[PDB]
Design a protein around this nucleic acid. Structure first.
Lengths: 63, 88, 19, 129, 83, 338, 106, 122, 137, 33, 193
RNA sequence: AUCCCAGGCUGA
RNA sequence: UUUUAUGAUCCCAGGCUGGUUUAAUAAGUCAAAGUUUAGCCGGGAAG
RNA sequence: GAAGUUAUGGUUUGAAAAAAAAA
RNA sequence: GGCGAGAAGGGAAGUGUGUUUCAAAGAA
C-alpha cells in the first residue's frame, strides 16, 4: 500500500542565491505532488509525451 | 426442464413475450438486418435475404402519434406517390 | 545552450538589444 | 557553461586561501551547492569576478579532483536508472542540472528526474565520457 | 467480427487461431501454445504466447502451462483451434 | 435556393425546439416564435437527426451565389460540429419531403410488400442515386424496361441516420413484368442529377431478387427458433414436411429441421424453412442450392432460396435500439474463414 | 538509413533528441528560403541526430516545399509546417500551419 | 566517394524497384471517413478487385492491364523462347480504344497507389 | 438558366491551334483557351474576364497532375531519386517541375470542369461542394 | 581528449583519424583469407 | 478507367476473403476463361463504362484546398459495447457448461439421418462453445470497463496536476522577467536623458 | 459477326 | 528558374531487422557497430 | 496507409541543368 | 464440378530496402 510522507517546508531564510531558493521551492512542491499522485499506463500517452514528462517532472512514487 | 428447446421456447413465448409484444407499440426498419453474410473460399454468393416483416396479429405497429406536415411544407406534397392519403 | 544554428538564434532573442 | 568549465581551474588551486573565477548565475548556483555540501569555506560576488574562499584540511585541500562531464560543445543527460549505475559506489559529488534547479546526484536519484551531468567533485576515478 | 478484433484478422494470412509451434532441439521437443493466423508459418509469425505443452517430462506427467485470462480473451475474440 | 438540409443534428438540438430556433436566428434565418422548420420523425415520434429549413420565398427568389455562400457559412458556424449543411433547390425540397413521408410510413409499406402473394413480384434495384424518388424509379423502369409499375408500391431502404439508402424494392404488377425488369435493368447507365438543364453524373443500376418479404402470423416467431435458417420455394404443392425431408435427403440437402409455410390460396408451390446446426452448414447448403439451380436450368433470378433474417425491430419503450446496440455479440455465431 | 538498437533507444541522449525532433501531427519548424512561386515556400528545418559512438548530437538541415494558401510567408520568416500525405504538383508536400517569427517588411 | 563534375545523362534507362500486389488490410476502411490523422487510411482489398463470377457469385481478381516494370529486362534471359516479349494489353470496346499503360508515380502514394497513367482515347 | 455544352469541333480547333497522340503543354493550351474567349462567352450566357491566374488555380485545385500521372516523367528522368519528394533525400537533387502535357480528352475534361466550377461560383445552388461540414458548436 | 569531436562534422571526420597500422596477419596476404 | 461495377454488399462481404495466389491468379487468365462473369470482360468493361458515362455531363472532381489538421491529445474513453448481464447469470452458465451437465446434454442430443453419432454430439458440443465464447466476452468487457474507469481517473488527475504546475512556473518566470525589463527601461531612459 | 454458351429477355 | 561542399551532376559494390544466458562491485536492457530456426519485403507475359 | 530516419568503400579528378543567343 | 497449390523466390531497388513513431468501421 502507498505510504505518503510529509515533505519538509523549504527554509525561508535563504542559505543560497535567490534563484536557487526559487528552484528549491518549486522542486519541493513538485516532488510532493509526484509522491501524492499516481500514474496511468503507457498506452494513454505517446512516446514523446512520456519523454517530455520524464525530463520535466519528478518520477511518481506510484506507477 | 427435460422438456426440449422448442417446447421451452414456445411456452415462454406464450406466457410472456407474446402479450408484451401485443401491448408494445412496434416499428420496422432495415438497417442492421441487411448486412450480407461474409464470403469464404467455399461460399462466394450474395443469396437473397428473406425479411420477415412483423404482422399486426402479434405486433401493435400502429403509430404513436398521427403524421404531421404543416404549411408551407404541404404545398410541396406529391399526392400521387403515396396511397396513404394524408390530411391535416 | 548548445545548438546556436540560424533558427535557434532567431528564436532565442528576448529583445533587440542586449544592454 | 564556458564560465563553469573555467571556474573549474579556479576551484582546483592549491596552497591558496582564495582564488577568483569568472562570474555567472550558473557559477553562483554551483557555488551554492558546493557550500551546502561543505566543500568551500565561502565565496563573494564582486562584479565581473567571484572570489572563492577555499577550505583545507590537514594541509591538503578539501576539493581533491574535478571531472567535467557536460561541456558547452556536448551535453550529457541521464535517466534515473543510468545515473544510479554511473554514480554507483562513490562518495563523490556529481552536480546535476534539472528542471528543479542545480542539485546533487543524490537529490536527482531520489526525485527520479532526468538531468544533465555537469561536474564530478572528489569522484576519484569514475567517468564514462 | 467486432471492431476491436479486426486487427487480429489478416487478409493475407487468415483468421486467428490457437495452435502449437514446435520447440526445443532434435529429440527433445515440446510445444509453444500461441495465437497466430491460419497461413502463418507454424514456427514463424504469431501474435501472442499463450503457454506451453510438454508431453514428455522427467516427472512422467504431461505438463500444460497456460495464461488462463489470455486463453479466455482469445476465445472471446474468436480464435479457432483443432481437436 | 429553396432551403437547407441539416443532417446529423445532435439529439439535444433535434429534441429542443427553442435551441434550434435560437441557433437559426443567430445564423440569420428568422424563425417565428419567414423560414419554416420540419424535422424527420418516425411513427414512434423519435427524431432521426435531419431537419429541413425552407427559406421565405416571396423574397429569397432573388438570392444569388454570394448570398448562398454567406448564409451557408453562417449556418455551418452556428450549428454543432459534426452536422452537415446542404443547399436544396425545389427538386431537393420535394425529395426531402417525400423521404420524410416514406420514412414515417415505411412499416405499412413493408407489410404491404410482405403480403405473401407478392413473393415473386418484388424486384430490388441498386444503387439508386439519392435524388431519385418513386416517380423517377417509375420513369426509369418505363424507359429502360418498357414496364409500367405503380409509383405507390416503391419502397426505399433507409439508413440509421434517416437518409435514404441506395436500395429500392418495386412491386411489379406481374411476374412477367418482374422478369422483364430483371433481364433489362443490368448495368444500365442512369443520370445522377439534373442541374443547369443537363444530366450530370452516371450511375450504373442493377436489378435482382435480393430482398424477399413475407408478412404473416405463422412466421413472426419463426426466425427466433434458430439463427441458421434457409428459406426455399418452388416445390410441388402437395408435399408435406416429411415428404420434403425425404426429398431433401434424396437431393443431398441435410437440414436439422423443416417447417412448411402455407398461406390462404396459392397451393401450386410449397415453401419450406430449413434449419441447420451451423452457419457453415447453412452456407454450404446455400452453395449446393446455387449449384442445383445452375444444373436444373431454372432462372438465375427465379426465386428459389434465401437466408432467413427477421427485420430489425424497434419498440417505443426501448432506450437503446437493438440494431444500434454496440454490445451485440451475434458475430460469434458466424466464424470467419479465409 | 540509420537503425538504433533496443538498448540504445532507452538512453537519455536518444530519447531527448527524439523528443526534440517529434511534434504533434509530425509538424516541423523552419524558416523560408524561397518565396518566388505562388502559394509555395521552401523551408529549411533543423533536424538532429544522436551519435552513440561519440555521445553527442549534431544538427543538419531538411529543406522541403510547403503550401501557403495565402501570401504571408516571405523570405526569412520562421514558420511551422505539417505534412500532407500527398504531393500537390511536383514539389509541395507540406502545408503551412502558422507563422512564428516575421522578418520586417517594407 | 566521387565529387567529380560530369554532364547530365539524357539517354540512360533509370531502373526502378519491383513491387508486387498488396493483399490489403481487414482492419482498413472500404469507404474512408474524415481522417483525424495525417494520411489516407489503407484499403481493405488492396490491389485486387471484386468482380462477378460465371456461377452467379463474386471473386477477387488482379488489375487489368497488368502492372509491369518495363525499366528492367525480362527475366530469365530466355523468357523470349516461351513468351511474347512485346506483348501489349489493349482496352477496346467496339470502335473506341484507350491507351493506358500503368507506371509508377512519385511518392507519397497514399490511397491512390503507386501506379497511374494518362487519358488517351482513340 | 442553363449551361450549354461546348462543341467538340470548336474544342478540337482550339486544341490544334495551340498545338501548332497529340499532347500540348498546359501553358499553350491555357493561352489558346484564354485567347479564344470561349469561357467569356459561357460566362456571358450564364463579370470580369477569366485570368491565367484563375486557370492555374483551378488546375492546381483539381489536381489533374496527380490524377493523370503527371509525375511519371520525373521517374523516367531521375529514376529512383524521383520517388522521394523535395527534401526526402537530404543530399538534394533536381525534380522537374514541368506541368502536365494534356491530350485532347484530358483537355476536354479540364475545360468541362473549369466551366462547371465557374458556373458554380455564381449559381445559387452549385453542382459541387453544396454541402459544408459545420465546425462551430 | 574530446578535442577530436569538435564541430558539426565530427561523426565523419574523427572516424577517419584513427590508427593505420598494418593488419595483424598481413604477412600471409597471398592466401586470400 | 473505372473498375467493373459491383454492389457495395459484395464489397462489404468480401472483407475477409483471401486474394488469389500465384497459381489461382494464373487460373483466372487462361484462355478458356470459363470463370468470367456478366459484364466482366477485362478488355471491354472499362471502355464500356466510360462510353456509357460520357452520354451525360461529367461532374468535375472536388476542389481540394489543403488545410492543417488541429492537434488534439489522445483521451481514453469508456468502453462502448459492454453487456449488462449479471455475474450471477454468468456464473450459473459457466457452472453448467464446465460441469458434468454439458457431457450429458451432448449424450442426449438427438441425431439426424446422415450424421454419425460423433457429429451430432460435436454440433451440440459446438453449440455450447458458442455460448462460452459469449460468456468470456462479457466478463472481459466488464473488467476492461472497470480498469478503463480507473485509468481515466488517473490520467485526468495527472493532466490537471501537470497543467497547474506548468502554469505556475510560467507565471513566476513572466513576473520575474517583467520586473527586470521594467527596471531596465527606466534605467535606459535616464541614460538617454 | 454468327462458331459456342447447362447465360438471359423480348415479338398482339 | 531549379539543385549544389549539409556533397548537386554523376560511375562500380553491397535487401534491412530480431535472438532471452552472458562471470569481473563491467550493469537494471551486453552498452558506437559482430548471430543462428525467424520478421518485413523482393514486376509481368498462352495474344 | 502516413512521418522521421548520419551513409560506407573503390584516393578522386565541382559545378549540373533549364532559359537566352546561334545558325 | 468445388477448394488449396511460388522446389517457399535474394533475379529489381542507395537515399532504396528495412527500421522507429503512429493510424486504419461496418449496419453510414
Amino acid at each position: 500500500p502507498p505510504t505518503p510522507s510529509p515533505f519538509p517546508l523549504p527554509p525561508s531564510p535563504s542559505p543560497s542565491s535567490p534563484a536557487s531558493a526559487a528552484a528549491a521551492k518549486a522542486a519541493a512542491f513538485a516532488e510532493q505532488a509526484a509522491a501524492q499522485t499516481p500514474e496511468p499506463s503507457v498506452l494513454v500517452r505517446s512516446a514523446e509525451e512520456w519523454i517530455k514528462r520524464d525530463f520535466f517532472f519528478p518520477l511518481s512514487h506510484q506507477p | 426442464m427435460q422438456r426440449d428447446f422448442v417446447d421451452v421456447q414456445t411456452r415462454y413465448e406464450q406466457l410472456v413475450t407474446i402479450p408484451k409484444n401485443k401491448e408494445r407499440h412496434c416499428e420496422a426498419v432495415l438497417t442492421k438486418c441487411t448486412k450480407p453474410l461474409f464470403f469464404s473460399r467455399y461460399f462466394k454468393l450474395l443469396p437473397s435475404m428473406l425479411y420477415v416483416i412483423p404482422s399486426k396479429a402479434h405486433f401493435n405497429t400502429a403509430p404513436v402519434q398521427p403524421f404531421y406536415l404543416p404549411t408551407p411544407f404541404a404545398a410541396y406534397r406529391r399526392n400521387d406517390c403515396f396511397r396513404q392519403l394524408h390530411s391535416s | 545552450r548548445l545548438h546556436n544554428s540560424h533558427q535557434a538564434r532567431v528564436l532565442r532573442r528576448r529583445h533587440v538589444y542586449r544592454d | 557553461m564556458q564560465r563553469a568549465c573555467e571556474m573549474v581551474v579556479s576551484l582546483l588551486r592549491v596552497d591558496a586561501l582564495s582564488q577568483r573565477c569568472p562570474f555567472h548565475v550558473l557559477n553562483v548556483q554551483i557555488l551554492d551547492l558546493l557550500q551546502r555540501e561543505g566543500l568551500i569555506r565561502g565565496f563573494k560576488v564582486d562584479g565581473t569576478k567571484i572570489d572563492i574562499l577555499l577550505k583545507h584540511y590537514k594541509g591538503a585541500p578539501v576539493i581533491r579532483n574535478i571531472r567535467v562531464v557536460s561541456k558547452p560543445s556536448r551535453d550529457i543527460w541521464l535517466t534515473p536508472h543510468e545515473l544510479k549505475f554511473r554514480t554507483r559506489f562513490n562518495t563523490g559529488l556529481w552536480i546535476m542540472q534539472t528542471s528543479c534547479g542545480v542539485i546533487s546526484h543524490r537529490d536527482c536519484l531520489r526525485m527520479g528526474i532526468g538531468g544533465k551531468m555537469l561536474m564530478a567533485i572528489n569522484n576519484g576515478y569514475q567517468h564514462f565520457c | 467480427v467486432r471492431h476491436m478484433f479486426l486487427p487480429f484478422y489478416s487478409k493475407e494470412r487468415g483468421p486467428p487461431r490457437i495452435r502449437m509451434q514446435v520447440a526445443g532441439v532434435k529429440g527433445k521437443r515440446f510445444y509453444k501454445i500461441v495465437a497466430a493466423n491460419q497461413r502463418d508459418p507454424r514456427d514463424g509469425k504469431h501474435m501472442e504466447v499463450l503457454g506451453s505443452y510438454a508431453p514428455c517430462t522427467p516427472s512422467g506427467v504431461e505438463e500444460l502451462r497456460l495464461r488462463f485470462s489470455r486463453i479466455k480473451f482469445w476465445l472471446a475474440a474468436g480464435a479457432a483451434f483443432n481437436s | 435556393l429553396e432551403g437547407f438540409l441539416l443532417s446529423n443534428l445532435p439529439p439535444e438540438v433535434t429534441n429542443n425546439q427553442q435551441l434550434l430556433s435560437s441557433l437559426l436566428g443567430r445564423a440569420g434565418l428568422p424563425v417565428p416564435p419567414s423560414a419554416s422548420i420540419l424535422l424527420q420523425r418516425s411513427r414512434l415520434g423519435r427524431t432521426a437527426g435531419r431537419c429541413l429549413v425552407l427559406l421565405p420565398f416571396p423574397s429569397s427568389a432573388f438570392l444569388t451565389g454570394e448570398d448562398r455562400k454567406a448564409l451557408q457559412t453562417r449556418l455551418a458556424a452556428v450549428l454543432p460540429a459534426g452536422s452537415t449543411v446542404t443547399a436544396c433547390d425545389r427538386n431537393d425540397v420535394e425529395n426531402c419531403i417525400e423521404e420524410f413521408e416514406r420514412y414515417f410510413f415505411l412499416t405499412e409499406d413493408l407489410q404491404r410488400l410482405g403480403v405473401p402473394s407478392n413473393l415473386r413480384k418484388v424486384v430490388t434495384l441498386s444503387p439508386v442515386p439519392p435524388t431519385y424518388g418513386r416517380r423517377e424509379v417509375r420513369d426509369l423502369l418505363r424507359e429502360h424496361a418498357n414496364v409500367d409499375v405503380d409509383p405507390r408500391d416503391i419502397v426505399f431502404r433507409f439508413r440509421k441516420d434517416g437518409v435514404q439508402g441506395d436500395t429500392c424494392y418495386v412491386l411489379c404488377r406481374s411476374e412477367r413484368d418482374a422478369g422483364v425488369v430483371l433481364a433489362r435493368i443490368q448495368e444500365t447507365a442512369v443520370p445522377n442529377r439534373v442541374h443547369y438543364g443537363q444530366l450530370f453524373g452516371c450511375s450504373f443500376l442493377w436489378a435482382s431478387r435480393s430482398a424477399l418479404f413475407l408478412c404473416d402470423s405463422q412466421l413472426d416467431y419463426l426466425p427466433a427458433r434458430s439463427p441458421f435458417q434457409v428459406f426455399t420455394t418452388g416445390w410441388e404443392g402437395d408435399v408435406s414436411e416429411e415428404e420434403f425431408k425425404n426429398l431433401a435427403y434424396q437431393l443431398r440437402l441435410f437440414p436439422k429441421a423443416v417447417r412448411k409455410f402455407s398461406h390462404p390460396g396459392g397451393e401450386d408451390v410449397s415453401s419450406f424453412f430449413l434449419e441447420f446446426h451451423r452457419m457453415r452448414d447453412a452456407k454450404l447448403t446455400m452453395s449446393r442450392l446455387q449449384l442445383l439451380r445452375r444444373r436444373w436450368r431454372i432462372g438465375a433470378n427465379t426465386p428459389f432460396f434465401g437466408f432467413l433474417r427477421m427485420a430489425d425491430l424497434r419498440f417505443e419503450d426501448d432506450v437503446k435500439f437493438a440494431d444500434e446496440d454496440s454490445a451485440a455479440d451475434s458475430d460469434l455465431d458466424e466464424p470467419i474463414d479465409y | 538509413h540509420w537503425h538504433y538498437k533496443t538498448w540504445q533507444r532507452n538512453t537519455a541522449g536518444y530519447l531527448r533528441t527524439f523528443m526534440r525532433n517529434k511534434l504533434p501531427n509530425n509538424e516541423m519548424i523552419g524558416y523560408v528560403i524561397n518565396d518566388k512561386h505562388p502559394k509555395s515556400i521552401r523551408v529549411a528545418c533543423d533536424r538532429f541526430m544522436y551519435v552513440m559512438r561519440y555521445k553527442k548530437t549534431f544538427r543538419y538541415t531538411k529543406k522541403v516545399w510547403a503550401h501557403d494558401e495565402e501570401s504571408e510567408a516571405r523570405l526569412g520568416d520562421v514558420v511551422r509546417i505539417q505534412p500532407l500525405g500527398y504531393r500537390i504538383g511536383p514539389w509541395k508536400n507540406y502545408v503551412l500551419v502558422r507563422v512564428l517569427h516575421k522578418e520586417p517588411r517594407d | 566517394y566521387r565529387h567529380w563534375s560530369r554532364h547530365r545523362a539524357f539517354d540512360r534507362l533509370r531502373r526502378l524497384p519491383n513491387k508486387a500486389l498488396r493483399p490489403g488490410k481487414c482492419a482498413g476502411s472500404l469507404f474512408p471517413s474524415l481522417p483525424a490523422s495525417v494520411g489516407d487510411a489503407p484499403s481493405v482489398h488492396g490491389d485486387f478487385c471484386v468482380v462477378r463470377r460465371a456461377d452467379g457469385g463474386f471473386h477477387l481478381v488482379p488489375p487489368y492491364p497488368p502492372r509491369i516494370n518495363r525499366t528492367v529486362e525480362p527475366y530469365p534471359p530466355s523468357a523470349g523462347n516461351f513468351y511474347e516479349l512485346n506483348r501489349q494489353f489493349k482496352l477496346q470496346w467496339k470502335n473506341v480504344e484507350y491507351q493506358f499503360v500503368p507506371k509508377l508515380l512519385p511518392r507519397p502514394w497514399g490511397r491512390a497507389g503507386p501506379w497511374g497513367g494518362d487519358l488517351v482515347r482513340i | 438558366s442553363s449551361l450549354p455544352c461546348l462543341l467538340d469541333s470548336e474544342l478540337t480547333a482550339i486544341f490544334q491551334g495551340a498545338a501548332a497522340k497529340i499532347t500540348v503543354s498546359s501553358n499553350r493550351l491555357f493561352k489558346a483557351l484564354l485567347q479564344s474567349g470561349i469561357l467569356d462567352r459561357d460566362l456571358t450566357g450564364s463579370r470580369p474576364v477569366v485570368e491565367f491566374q484563375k486557370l492555374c488555380d483551378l488546375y492546381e485545385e483539381g489536381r489533374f497532375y496527380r490524377t493523370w500521372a503527371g509525375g511519371a516523367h520525373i521517374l523516367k528522368i531521375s529514376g529512383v531519386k524521383g520517388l522521394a519528394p523535395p527534401g526526402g533525400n537530404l543530399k538534394g537533387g533536381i525534380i522537374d517541375g514541368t506541368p502536365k502535357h494534356m491530350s485532347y480528352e484530358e483537355f476536354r475534361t479540364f475545360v468541362h470542369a473549369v466551366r462547371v466550377w465557374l458556373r458554380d461560383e455564381r449559381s445559387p445552388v452549385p453542382l459541387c461542394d453544396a454541402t459544408v461540414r459545420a465546425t462551430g458548436s | 581528449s574530446t578535442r577530436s569531436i569538435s564541430g558539426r562534422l565530427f561523426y565523419k571526420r574523427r572516424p577517419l583519424q584513427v590508427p593505420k597500422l598494418k593488419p595483424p596477419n598481413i604477412r600471409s596476404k597471398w592466401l586470400e583469407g | 478507367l473505372p473498375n467493373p461495377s459491383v454492389p457495395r454488399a459484395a464489397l462489404v462481404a468480401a472483407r475477409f476473403l483471401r486474394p488469389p495466389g500465384r497459381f489461382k491468379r494464373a487460373e483466372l487468365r487462361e484462355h478458356p476463361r470459363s470463370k468470367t462473369g456478366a459484364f466482366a470482360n477485362l478488355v471491354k468493361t472499362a471502355v464500356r463504362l466510360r462510353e456509357k458515362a460520357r452520354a451525360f455531363s461529367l461532374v468535375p472532381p472536388p476542389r481540394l484546398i489543403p488545410i492543417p489538421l488541429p492537434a488534439r491529445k489522445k483521451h481514453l474513453e469508456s468502453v462502448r459495447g459492454v453487456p449488462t448481464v449479471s455475474s450471477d447469470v454468468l456464473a450459473r452458465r459457466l457452472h453448467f457448461l464446465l460441469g458434468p451437465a454439458a457431457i450429458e446434454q451432448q449424450k442426449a442430443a438427438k441425431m439426424q439421418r446422415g450424421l454419425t453419432p460423433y457429429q451430432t454430439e460435436l454440433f451440440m458440443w459446438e453449440r455450447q462453445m458458442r455460448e462460452i465464447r459469449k460468456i468470456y466476452r462479457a466478463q472481459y468487457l466488464q473488467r476492461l470497463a472497470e480498469v478503463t474507469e480507473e485509468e481515466r481517473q488517473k490520467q485526468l488527475q495527472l493532466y490537471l496536476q501537470e497543467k497547474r504546475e506548468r502554469r505556475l512556473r510560467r507565471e513566476e518566470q513572466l513576473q520575474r522577467i517583467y520586473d527586470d525589463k521594467k527596471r531596465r527601461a527606466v534605467l535606459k531612459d535616464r541614460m538617454r536623458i
